[PDB]
mmCIF file of N, CA and C and ligand atoms in Angstrom:
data_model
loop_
_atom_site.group_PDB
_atom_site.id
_atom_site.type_symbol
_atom_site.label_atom_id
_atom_site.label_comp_id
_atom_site.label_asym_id
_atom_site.label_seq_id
_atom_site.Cartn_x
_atom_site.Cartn_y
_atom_site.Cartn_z
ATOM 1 N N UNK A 292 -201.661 32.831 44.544
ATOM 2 C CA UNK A 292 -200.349 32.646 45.195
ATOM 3 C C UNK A 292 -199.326 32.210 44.157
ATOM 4 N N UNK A 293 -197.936 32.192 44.840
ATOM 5 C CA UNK A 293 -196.905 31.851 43.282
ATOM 6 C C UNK A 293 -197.073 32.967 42.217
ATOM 7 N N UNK A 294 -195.967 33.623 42.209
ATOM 8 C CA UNK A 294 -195.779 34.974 41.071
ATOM 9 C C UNK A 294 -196.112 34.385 39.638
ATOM 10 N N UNK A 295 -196.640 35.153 39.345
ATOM 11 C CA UNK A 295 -197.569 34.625 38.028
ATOM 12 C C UNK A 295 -196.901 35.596 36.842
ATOM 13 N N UNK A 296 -196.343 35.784 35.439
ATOM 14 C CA UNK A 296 -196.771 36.386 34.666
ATOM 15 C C UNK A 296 -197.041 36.751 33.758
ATOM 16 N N UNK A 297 -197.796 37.317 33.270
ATOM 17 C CA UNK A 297 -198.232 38.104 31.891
ATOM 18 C C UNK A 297 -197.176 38.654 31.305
ATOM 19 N N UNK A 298 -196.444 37.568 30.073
ATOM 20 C CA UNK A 298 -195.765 38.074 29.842
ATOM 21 C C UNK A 298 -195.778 38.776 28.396
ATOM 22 N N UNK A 299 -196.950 38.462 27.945
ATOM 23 C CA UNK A 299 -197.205 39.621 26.826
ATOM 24 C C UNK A 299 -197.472 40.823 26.885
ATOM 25 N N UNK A 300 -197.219 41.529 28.073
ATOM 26 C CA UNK A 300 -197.276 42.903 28.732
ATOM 27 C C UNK A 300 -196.152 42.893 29.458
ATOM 28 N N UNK A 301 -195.732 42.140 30.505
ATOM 29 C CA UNK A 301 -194.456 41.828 31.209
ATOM 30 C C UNK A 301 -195.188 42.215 32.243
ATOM 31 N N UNK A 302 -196.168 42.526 32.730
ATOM 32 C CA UNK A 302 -196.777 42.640 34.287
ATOM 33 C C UNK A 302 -197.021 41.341 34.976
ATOM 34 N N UNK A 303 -196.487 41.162 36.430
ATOM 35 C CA UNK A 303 -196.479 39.983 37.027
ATOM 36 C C UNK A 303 -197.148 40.037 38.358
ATOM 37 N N UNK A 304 -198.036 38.979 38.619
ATOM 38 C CA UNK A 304 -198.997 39.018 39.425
ATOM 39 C C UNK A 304 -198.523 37.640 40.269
ATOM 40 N N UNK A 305 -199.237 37.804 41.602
ATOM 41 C CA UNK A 305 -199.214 36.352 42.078
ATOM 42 C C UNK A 305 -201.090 35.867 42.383
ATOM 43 N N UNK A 306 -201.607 36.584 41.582
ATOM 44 C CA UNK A 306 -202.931 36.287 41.446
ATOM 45 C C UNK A 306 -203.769 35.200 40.299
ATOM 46 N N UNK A 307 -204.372 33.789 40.933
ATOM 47 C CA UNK A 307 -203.889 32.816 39.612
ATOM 48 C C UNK A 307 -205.494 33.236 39.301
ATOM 49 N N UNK A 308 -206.439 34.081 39.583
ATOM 50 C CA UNK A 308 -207.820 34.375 38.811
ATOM 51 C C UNK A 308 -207.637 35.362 38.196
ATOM 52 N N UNK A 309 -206.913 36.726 38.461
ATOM 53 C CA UNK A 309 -206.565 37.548 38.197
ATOM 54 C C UNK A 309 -206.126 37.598 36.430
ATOM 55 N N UNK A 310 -204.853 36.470 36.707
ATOM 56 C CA UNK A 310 -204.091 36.321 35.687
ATOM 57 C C UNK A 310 -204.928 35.698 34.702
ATOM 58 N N UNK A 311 -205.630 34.771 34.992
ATOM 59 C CA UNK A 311 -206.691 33.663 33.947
ATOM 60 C C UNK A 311 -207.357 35.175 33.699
ATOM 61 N N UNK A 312 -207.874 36.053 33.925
ATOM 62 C CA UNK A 312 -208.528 37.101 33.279
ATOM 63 C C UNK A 312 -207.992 37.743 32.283
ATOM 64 N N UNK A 313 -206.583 37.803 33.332
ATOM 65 C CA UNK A 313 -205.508 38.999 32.298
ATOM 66 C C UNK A 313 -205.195 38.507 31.052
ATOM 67 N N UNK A 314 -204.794 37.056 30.684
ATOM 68 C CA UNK A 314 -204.612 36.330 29.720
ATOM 69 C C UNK A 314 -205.717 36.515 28.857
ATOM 70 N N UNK A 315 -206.805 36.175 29.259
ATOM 71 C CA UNK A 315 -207.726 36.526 28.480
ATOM 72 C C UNK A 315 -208.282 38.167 27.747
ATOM 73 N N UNK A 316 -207.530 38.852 28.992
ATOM 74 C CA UNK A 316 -208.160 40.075 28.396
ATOM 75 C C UNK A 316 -206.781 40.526 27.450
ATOM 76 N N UNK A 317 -206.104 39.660 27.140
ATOM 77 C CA UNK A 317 -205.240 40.124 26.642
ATOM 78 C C UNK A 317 -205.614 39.475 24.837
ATOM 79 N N UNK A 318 -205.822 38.584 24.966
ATOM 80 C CA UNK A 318 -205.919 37.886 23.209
ATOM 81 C C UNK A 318 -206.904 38.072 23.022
ATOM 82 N N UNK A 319 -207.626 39.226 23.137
ATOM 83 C CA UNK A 319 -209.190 39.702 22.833
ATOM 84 C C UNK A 319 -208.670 41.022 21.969
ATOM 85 N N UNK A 320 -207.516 41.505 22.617
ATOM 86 C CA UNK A 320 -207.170 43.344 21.755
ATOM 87 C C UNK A 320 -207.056 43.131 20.359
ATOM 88 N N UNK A 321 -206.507 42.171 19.784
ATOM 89 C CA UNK A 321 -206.110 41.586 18.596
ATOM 90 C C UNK A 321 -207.269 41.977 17.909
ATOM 91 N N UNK A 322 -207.158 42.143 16.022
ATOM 92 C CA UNK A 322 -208.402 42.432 15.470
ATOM 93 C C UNK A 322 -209.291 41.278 15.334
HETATM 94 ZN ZN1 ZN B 635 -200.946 41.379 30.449
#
Protein backbone atom coordinates (compact mmCIF):
# COMPACT_ATOMS: atom_id res chain seq x y z
CA UNK A 1 0.00 0.00 0.00
CA UNK A 2 1.33 3.78 -0.36
CA UNK A 3 2.83 4.39 -4.00
CA UNK A 4 6.17 3.22 -3.82
CA UNK A 5 9.04 4.04 -6.29
CA UNK A 6 11.77 2.62 -8.11
CA UNK A 7 13.31 5.29 -9.01
CA UNK A 8 16.29 3.97 -10.72
CA UNK A 9 13.99 2.79 -13.50
CA UNK A 10 11.21 5.39 -12.65
CA UNK A 11 8.53 2.51 -12.35
CA UNK A 12 6.19 3.06 -9.38
CA UNK A 13 4.46 0.54 -7.45
CA UNK A 14 2.30 0.61 -4.37
CA UNK A 15 3.62 -2.83 -3.59
CA UNK A 16 6.07 -2.60 -0.38
CA UNK A 17 7.36 -6.64 -1.14
CA UNK A 18 7.28 -6.14 -4.57
CA UNK A 19 9.43 -3.10 -4.40
CA UNK A 20 11.98 -4.66 -1.59
CA UNK A 21 12.49 -7.18 -4.59
CA UNK A 22 12.62 -4.63 -7.26
CA UNK A 23 15.33 -2.72 -5.38
CA UNK A 24 17.09 -5.56 -5.09
CA UNK A 25 16.75 -6.86 -8.41
CA UNK A 26 17.91 -3.82 -9.43
CA UNK A 27 21.68 -3.39 -7.75
CA UNK A 28 22.41 -6.93 -8.83
CA UNK A 29 22.57 -5.75 -12.96
CA UNK A 30 25.69 -3.83 -12.09
CA UNK A 31 29.04 -5.77 -12.95
ZN1 LIG B 1 13.22 -0.59 -10.90
Amino acid sequence: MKPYVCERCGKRFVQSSQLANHIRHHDNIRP
